[PDB]
Amino acid sequence: LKDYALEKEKVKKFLQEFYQDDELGKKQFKYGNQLVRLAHREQVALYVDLDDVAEDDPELVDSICENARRYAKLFADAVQELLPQYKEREVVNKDVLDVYIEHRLMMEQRSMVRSPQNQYPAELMRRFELYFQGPSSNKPRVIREVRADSVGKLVTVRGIVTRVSEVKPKMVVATYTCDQCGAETYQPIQSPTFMPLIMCPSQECQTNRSGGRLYLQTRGSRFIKFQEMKMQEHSDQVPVGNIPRSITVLVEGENTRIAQPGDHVSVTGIFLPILRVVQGLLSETYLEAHRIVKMNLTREELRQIAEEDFYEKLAASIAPEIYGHEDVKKALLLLLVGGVDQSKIRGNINICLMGDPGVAKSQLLSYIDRLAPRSQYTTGGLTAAVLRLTLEGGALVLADQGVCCIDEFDKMAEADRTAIHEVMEQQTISIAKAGILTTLNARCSILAAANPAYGRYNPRRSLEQNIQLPAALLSRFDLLWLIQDRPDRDNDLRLAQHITYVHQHSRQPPSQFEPLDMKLMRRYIAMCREKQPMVPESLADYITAAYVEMRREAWASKDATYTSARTLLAILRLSTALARLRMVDVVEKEDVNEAIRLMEMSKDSLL
């Protein structure tokens, strides 16, 4: 419907005659300089921002979106035509492909009407790569929304990398040398596999019918770095009653080695099919990546934040249907807001809940997984793996600054135990399948749930006696809460009343403060994450006093209560988390006291 020659003219005009004032308002041809650098082999990839094109031609941007491969090729051809003009220095012939190209051009110019086949492929006159950056107007598209209707259109999606393969050389233009004519044969490759040529199509051999047999040569051919990755829907966009979906992404060129498993990234690229037949051909789809970027209220709202009970209110909102466990809910909220990591300090607050069956632990974990922006749920895989040859992040990796809720912790494999120990020690996961120790950044808070072995917990038996977990591993956790289902007629009656009300109204009994909607909770959590409160030196004295007091009490206690520097670190983390909740950049006596109270209550829960 349009003349692509005119489109080539328009893109050449745009590249030649586009200028945006740089630092200090310096009128500079943003793409002219890049063209110069490419002409000197000083650059390899040329990213094009579609906003710049929209600056003077929205129609061109719309056409590019409607059909992306065509305009990518058009831009590449335009740059190829322009490069000689902008060349100004005969840079040293880098690599062997530059000298090979120079020799080919000299031979061709050493020649008139010629057959279309008997000419160099455009892709061989290359080593400048082109890519597009999606326009600001086009919003990011959820992976589930990318359907067959958008195939062939440039789209920007956001997700979490679940696996990335090692960089490998992919052939773009196979080169062959004949046995008789001494000419050269070329074969552009688009498919994932190809049939190597056998008999040369050279005019000389054809006329002489010598049947010269081609031999593939790697030096002549042209390769490109290539990586296959899978990007998964980020948990925010996933529907409540569904699971994340995955999209394969084929990264090539400079874009390679720009993403890692667990990275929350945004990819702008072309959605195209790959044919690796009911009423038409059926093909699998992928996303040809172009740009990869690793991503990181009302007045009454502020008034509510200013309320002293605000924090308590938020605690009441943590799974309101779960009657009781108020302090446990508070600890969960502290985990959700996390530490500060002032510099660096491990900001994750690991919590473990050991208890008899049927005390809402799993429900609590599920609620946390629903409320935490980045969440993972597991039961015991958790750690990364090497599938066969690609890294595949486990749930722990997928957390990556989120929260990993591990139910049925007591039934975890010993290797998994060691893995989580490493996660809590360095926030990294070391995995080796072929004798290669690969370290992945897994910095995520851990919320574990466990049940005593051989039935309900026995108070007369010490910890690790009713449970089969290493004592040290438990000591790693900042907070360890023991939930006991002690039959108390009053409390049991209260719980029964609550459950009956739920069954008779599908809602929890009315409380002093109505629970807040999950979205609002998340918003407040993020607002808290904004702050990084400090610890004034004055408070140090009191904190140290408290620590020495509690350690003395533990020594007085006949049974060791796991007191150590870990405890002091946890106290500090909790205090700074409460400071975050207060939206105050300086911790306060109040916060320290509250943290101490929570710690004491945990240790008492072990009573």
235 within 8 A of 244, measured Cβ to Cβ: yes
> Quick one: 58 or 182, whose CB is closer to Zn ion?
182
Query: Could you say which of 26, 219, 489, 503 contacts other proteins (CB under 8 A)?
Result: 219
**358 known member of a binding site:** yes
Question: To the nearest 10°, the Cα dihedral for 369, 371, 374, 378?
Answer: 0
Q: Judged by CB under 6 A, which stretch of 258-266, 295-303, 434-442, 559-567 contacts ligand ATP? A: 559-567
Please state whether beta strands 403-406 and 390-392 pair in parallel, antiparallel, or not at all (unpaired): unpaired
Q: Does 103 bind other proteins (CB under 8 A)?
A: yes
Q: Which helix (H) or strand (E) holds 574?
A: helix 565-582
Q: Does 363 bind ligand ATP (CB under 6 A)?
A: yes
**476 known member of a binding site:** yes
**286 known member of a binding site:** no
At its nearest, how many Å lie between other proteins and the CB of residue 397? 12
283 within 8 A of 275, measured Cβ to Cβ: yes
Q: Does 427 bind other proteins (CB under 8 A)?
A: no
Q: Does 557 bind other proteins (CB under 8 A)?
A: no
Q: Does 359 bind ligand ATP (CB under 6 A)?
A: yes
Distance of CA 536 to the CA centre of its chain: 35
At its nearest, how many Å lie between ligand ATP and the CB of residue 539? 20
Q: Does 234 bind ligand ATP (CB under 6 A)?
A: no
Q: Does 361 bind ligand ATP (CB under 6 A)?
A: yes
Q: Does 472 bind ligand ATP (CB under 6 A)?
A: yes
Q: Judged by CB under 8 A, which stretch of 74-82, 210-218, 279-287, 372-380 contacts other proteins? A: 210-218
- What spatial distance separates the first Cα and last Cα of the chain, rounded to whole Å? 80
| Interacting partner of 363 out of Mg ion, ligand ATP, other proteins, none (Cβ under 5 to 8 A depending on kind) | ligand ATP
Residue 384 in tokens: 């990364």
At its nearest, how many Å lie between ligand ATP and the CB of residue 363? 5
**442 known member of a binding site:** no
Distance CA 591, CA 593 (A): 5
- Judged by CB under 5 A, the chain residues 66 through 85 that form the site for Zn ion are none
Q: Does 362 bind Mg ion (CB under 5 A)?
A: yes
Residue 450 in tokens: 């466990």
Q: Does 586 bind other proteins (CB under 8 A)?
A: no
- Judged by CB under 5 A, the chain residues 176 through 195 that form the site for Zn ion are 178, 180-181
Q: Does 366 bind Mg ion (CB under 5 A)?
A: no
At its nearest, how many Å lie between ligand ATP and the CB of residue 331? 15
| Interacting partner of 451 out of other proteins, ligand ATP, Zn ion, none (Cβ under 5 to 8 A depending on kind) | ligand ATP
Q: Does 164 bind ligand ATP (CB under 6 A)?
A: no
- Judged by CB under 5 A, the chain residues 194 through 233 that form the site for Zn ion are 200, 202, 205, 212
Distance CA 571, CA 515 (A): 28
**DSSP characters for 57-93?**
-HHHHHHHHH-HHHHHHHHHHHHHHHHHHH--S----
Q: Does 558 bind other proteins (CB under 8 A)?
A: no
> Quick one: 80 or 180, whose CB is closer to Zn ion?
180
Query: Could you say which of 133, 260, 379, 427 contacts other proteins (CB under 8 A)?
Result: 260
50 within 8 A of 61, measured Cβ to Cβ: yes
- Judged by CB under 8 A, the chain residues 487 through 546 that form the site for other proteins are 534-537, 540, 543-544
Counting Cβ atoms within 10 Å, is residue 17 exposed (0-12), middle (13-18) or buried (19+)?
exposed
**367 known member of a binding site:** no
Residue 165's DSSP bridge partners are 390
Counting Cβ atoms within 10 Å, is residue 430 exposed (0-12), middle (13-18) or buried (19+)?
middle
**361 known member of a binding site:** yes
Question: To the nearest 10°, the Cα dihedral for 247, 147, 275, 292?
Answer: -40
Residue type, 198: I
Query: Could you say which of 119, 283, 439, 468 contacts other proteins (CB under 8 A)?
Result: 439
Counting Cβ atoms within 10 Å, is residue 318 exposed (0-12), middle (13-18) or buried (19+)?
buried
Q: Judged by CB under 5 A, which stretch of 39-47, 358-366, 424-432, 557-565 contacts Mg ion? A: 358-366
Q: Judged by CB under 8 A, which stretch of 110-118, 301-309, 402-410, 422-430 contacts other proteins? A: 422-430
Q: Judged by CB under 8 A, which stretch of 89-97, 117-125, 403-411, 521-529 contacts other proteins? A: 89-97
> Quick one: 215 or 513, whose CB is closer to Zn ion?
215
Helix 326-337 to helix 310-317 angle (10° resolution) is 100
* Exposed e or buried b per residue across 370-398, where buried means at least 16 C-beta atoms within 10 angstroms of its C-beta: ebbebbbbbbbbbbbeeeeebbbbbbbbb
- Judged by CB under 6 A, the chain residues 98 through 117 that form the site for ligand ATP are none
- Enter the DSSP assignment of 517: P
| Interacting partner of 360 out of other proteins, ligand ATP, Mg ion, none (Cβ under 5 to 8 A depending on kind) | ligand ATP
Q: Does 4 bind other proteins (CB under 8 A)?
A: no
**165 known member of a binding site:** no
- Judged by CB under 6 A, the chain residues 440 through 469 that form the site for ligand ATP are 449, 451
Residue 220 in tokens: 């002549």
Q: Does 283 bind ligand ATP (CB under 6 A)?
A: no
Distance of CA 60 to the CA centre of its chain: 32
Query: Could you say which of 20, 218, 283, 511 contacts other proteins (CB under 8 A)?
Result: 218
- Enter the DSSP assignment of 426: H
Query: Could you say which of 171, 216, 495, 534 contacts ligand ATP (CB under 6 A)?
Result: 495
> CA–CA distance from 7 to each of 34, 50, 61, 73 (Å)?
21, 15, 12, 11
Q: Which of 517, 586, 590 is nearest to 301 (CA)?
A: 517
Q: Does 38 bind ligand ATP (CB under 6 A)?
A: no
Dihedral sign from CA coordinates of 192, 197, 201, 204:
positive
Q: Does 430 bind other proteins (CB under 8 A)?
A: yes
553 within 8 A of 327, measured Cβ to Cβ: no
> Quick one: 33 or 468, whose CB is closer to other proteins?
468
**507 known member of a binding site:** no
Counting Cβ atoms within 10 Å, is residue 35 exposed (0-12), middle (13-18) or buried (19+)?
buried
In the complex, the residues that contact ligand ATP under the rule CB under 6 A are 322-325, 357-363, 449, 451, 472, 495, 564-566
In the complex, the residues that contact Zn ion under the rule CB under 5 A are 178, 180-181, 200, 202, 205, 212
Enumerate the known binding-site residues for ATP: 323, 358, 360-362, 451, 476, 566
Enumerate the known binding-site residues: 323, 358, 360-362, 451, 476, 566
